Ligand binder design. Structure first.
Ligand SMILES: *[C@H]1O[C@H](CO)[C@@H](O[C@@H]2O[C@H](CO)[C@@H](O[C@@H]3O[C@H](CO)[C@@H](O)[C@H](O[C@@H]4O[C@H](CO)[C@@H](O)[C@H](O)[C@@H]4O)[C@@H]3O)[C@H](O)[C@H]2NC(C)=O)[C@H](O)[C@H]1NC(C)=O
Lengths: 387, 145, 48
């Protein structure tokens, strides 16, 4: 049983693609074996993806695992609603309800909004780039009106890397305009550090300031450079390094030859890569549950050119979508379950604040129970009471 | 994509058409690659894309100054999903500059079954903050609705 | 010491350091140059 799958990896996602292979051998079987035809492409270019899709499609493919961008996502979701090809991605959740998509990434919109109510914030600023959709911004915008908050929403993405020294001082002249001491960082991990390094140098990281890192990869980036500053830094985790399942992974993964599996030698792993390694598991457990049900999926003939006019949807596509979406496996990203639209459901998200001795978990956000804390601390009001 | 390659294989010299917020990333990509020349009256691109002739003049600056004109400081901004969130993010970045208090509410996703109810649900919630200053920014059809 | 200072936040408006040598611009200064704090030193090689 030789199964052909198409791979869409952006330029230099080395840890993801490395984890992609260590999953191939982890979930390797003697029943069948996934034969991946991989395409290295610039994700941003819609033309590049389109021709790579047409390369994969005419070659005959059962499923595609890839990454998209806010520029490309409406090329992938448009060609996957037509040619019924299943798409697995660790990228941001789709803006709406697109079919034949398996978003390995849990919607973060739900967690962040329930976090702000915990700190009892009322006035803050929002920093974001559109790279992971304007969905998360319209979330804090809509919720702002309901219980009256005050949010300074600033687009941070469109700054070139030739003149950026005076676009950050200018930025934080508008953020002293209302004594802004509470800032949300909903950005790419790179833009997070570019912001932080700049914030370090204008010294807005002492006691009084409070940051929220709105991505599923908190301990992914650098945090030591804001470890002794004093300011409060909050973020989200999803790759629990205390869970024994990932702990075994961490034992092996941190000890691989670094030349073989690039940027994988650490005792830590990015959430995008920890989704890819969990994405392989779901694709494997789906193609076992297709032969277990004895249902056949073998492509009758070639698919032909993808621009086929009129286009023919090969029937077994709607079954592969079904099988994929009904899989329930346990991986790095905790629990993996989907619904009729590919959205991750019944998932754990960790809330992690920064402290002196390191990062620390005060609790978790549930998709059903909202923000629920963890009992491991002593009472703070518990001082010396005088008789 | 099909309609483009259809015209491209026909070897036309310049394409005239439209697009949506979703499709524009396809049009622009195939033009900056195949050197295809495109002309459109739909909303201006989100940057500097080559081989594109936007007949629609940049609307942003005109709107921004009109608020600056009327000496507003606290207004409501209903918005549609259509012509991008360009003329919204503009007034939401300038919010801090000239001291504004912007209430932005999405309206481009109302169902036509309860259209008359949701439109009366919004405004009877806008007498909460009693905001009597509203900018619309919509497809002319959604305006009269 | 400078590197250590930046990390702990003792280089904002409210602090003042005096670099006691003949080569102020000889070292690195850009890592606190925007910090708001005032830093003084001494130059012995006038580039002008
Ligand atoms: C939504 O997501 C929930 C969180 O992942 C998920 O939760 C769990 O439910 C399953 C089964 O109900 C739990 O699995 C078990 O753990 C117990 C205790 O360690 C084991 O004994 C058990 O072994 C079972 O043993 C049976 C013996 O006859 C055997 O027949 C069964 O097949 C099975 O092997 C399971 O290993 C899991 O731990 C739960 N997670 C939690 C809360 O920690 C929900 O299922 C999911 N909701 C739905 C309805 O989709």
């Amino acid at each position: 049983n030789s199964i052909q799958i198409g791979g869409l990896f952006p330029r230099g996602a080395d840890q993801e693609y490395s984890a992609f292979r260590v999953g191939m051998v982890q979930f390797s079987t003697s029943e069948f074996r996934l034969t991946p035809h991989i395409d290295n492409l610039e994700v941003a270019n819609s033309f590049a993806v389109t021709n790579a899709f047409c390369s994969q499609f005419s070659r005959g493919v059962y499923a595609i695992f890839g990454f998209y961008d806010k520029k490309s996502v409406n090329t992938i979701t448009s060609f996957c609603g037509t040619l019924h090809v299943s798409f697995i991605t660790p990228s941001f959740p789709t803006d709406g309800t697109h079919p034949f998509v398996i978003q390995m990434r849990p919607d973060l919109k739900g967690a962040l909004l329930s976090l702000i109510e915990y700190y009892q914030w009322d006035k803050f600023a929002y920093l974001y780039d559109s790279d992971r959709g304007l969905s998360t911004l319209q979330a804090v915008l809509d919720s702002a009106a309901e219980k009256k908050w005050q949010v300074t929403a600033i687009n941070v993405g469109n700054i070139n890397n030739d003149k950026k020294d005076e676009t950050y001082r200018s930025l934080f002249q508008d953020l002293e305009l209302k004594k802004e001491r509470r800032v949300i960082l909903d950005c790419e991990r790179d833009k997070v550090n570019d912001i932080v390094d700049q914030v370090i140098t204008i010294g807005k990281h002492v006691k009084g300031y409070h940051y929220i890192i709105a991505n599923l990869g908190f301990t992914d980036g650098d945090l030591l450079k804001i470890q002794f500053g004093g300011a409060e830094v909050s973020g989200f985790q999803i790759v629990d390094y205390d869970d024994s399942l990932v702990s075994k992974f961490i034992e092996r993964w941190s000890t691989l030859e670094e030349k073989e599996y690039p940027g994988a030698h650490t005792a830590t792993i990015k959430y995008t890569s920890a989704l890819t390694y969990d994405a392989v598991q779901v694709m494997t457990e789906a193609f076992r549950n297709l032969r277990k049900q004895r249902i056949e999926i073998s492509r009758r003939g070639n698919a032909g050119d993808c621009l086929a006019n009129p286009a023919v949807p090969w029937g077994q596509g709607v079954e592969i979508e079904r099988a994929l979406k009904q899989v329930q496996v346990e991986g790095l990203s905790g629990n993996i379950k989907f619904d009729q639209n590919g959205k991750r459901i019944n998932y754990t998200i960790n809330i992690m604040e920064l402290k002196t001795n390191g990062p620390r978990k005060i609790g978790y956000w549930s998709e059903v129970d909202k923000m629920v804390l963890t009992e491991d601390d002593t009472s703070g009001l518990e001082q010396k009471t005088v008789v």
